[PDB]
Symmetry: C2
Subunit: 212 residues, 2 copies
């Protein structure tokens, strides 16, 4: 049943990702469309993934202590725990982009949220990619994720641009730009995690390190 | 000898941090002073930490499979592996800030690297803090690390500022600003990891989650 166990542990994770995927999808839509009811769907339904992560640690720790995994299987059980956390953190930033969507209520953005939306989706994809890479166990999608990162960078600068330029300085509108800035950061944390997941996937496989 | 084992596993990590600490210290000095010989000290002496991380996984995985850790001890052996990786990644960004220091040779910065230096040190401290928090196992230093983050944020904007403003557009000088931008990102990845380490330390202890 062993081989089967590692197959489910594998699906437990891929599962966390399927959900974090969704949560991410809505978190952004919720924010861009300014949908409070949606932002909440995101919050209320998150502790659920914290649940899966525990499951994934209990299960893995068990194997590591019961079925006595051999080197190779042991690395894939370990990376399984490191990746689960990254999926968890990402999911958490989602919950936060959702709280920020609320922070600002419904008084239409002080500027265009277009580049920010694309910066989010860019990162989101980095996740899908990284998780897909984990699923298939493809250690080469990584270097490709590297580029979506340069894109998240140039996308970011192009954020501070349309932001710290626009003059119309006022308490309410500033408290507004901040939330936008906060969101820009959670998108970069979400990206760095996809990258983190890519690192594991790559070390597990190539024993080498994630490229630029 | 068990209790003793967990004490050394604990010191293995605190050890990785003592070194990553240094590496970080020099990486920045090297860059700000533009010291190639130093940037190299950083590169050449890094595979050494990748070494410690392996040690920390082999050792922990062993306990988890040999001395049969009980719940509490088991969480502290697990977080021990998650944190080791974060220390590893941070150390790696160091190696990269060091490669970027070289990327630009010695033709004095197109602008003032003061705010960037402070943004680096700010993150660096977040690390020391997070690692110190791990050592003592103080789950409250976290919320304090949270603030050094808001500071890393406001410090960042104040980066794009003196950057995308300065007009003097030219191939060499641009290829120059980019490296600076790249460095700004590795500093933010280093911060998000300190934050990551803080998360573990907090979940392990409070079972709850790392604050804003």
């Amino acid at each position: 049943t062993f081989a089967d166990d590692l197959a489910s542990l594998h699906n437990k994770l891929i599962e966390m990702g399927r959900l974090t995927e969704v949560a991410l999808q809505q978190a952004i839509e919720a924010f861009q469309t300014q949908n409070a009811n949606l932002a909440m769907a995101v919050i209320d339904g998150d502790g659920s993934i914290d649940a899966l992560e525990e499951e994934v640690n209990d299960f893995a720790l068990w194997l590591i202590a019961a079925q006595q995994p051999v080197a190779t299987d042991l690395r894939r059980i370990v990376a399984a725990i490191k990746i689960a956390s990254d999926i968890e953190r990402i999911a958490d930033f989602a919950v936060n982009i959702a709280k920020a969507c609320i922070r600002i209520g419904g008084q239409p953005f002080v500027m265009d949220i277009g580049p920010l939306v694309l910066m989010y989706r860019l990162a989101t994809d980095m996740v899908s990619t990284a998780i897909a890479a984990y699923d298939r166990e493809d250690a080469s999608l990584a270097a490709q994720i590297a580029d979506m990162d340069h894109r998240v960078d140039e996308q970011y600068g192009e954020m501070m641009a349309s932001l710290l330029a626009v003059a119309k300085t006022d308490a309410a509108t500033l408290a507004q730009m901040n939330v936008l800035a906060l969101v820009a950061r959670y998108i970069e944390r979400t990206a760095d995690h996809a990258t983190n997941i890519a690192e594991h996937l790559v070390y597990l496989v190539k024993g080498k390190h994630y490229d630029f």
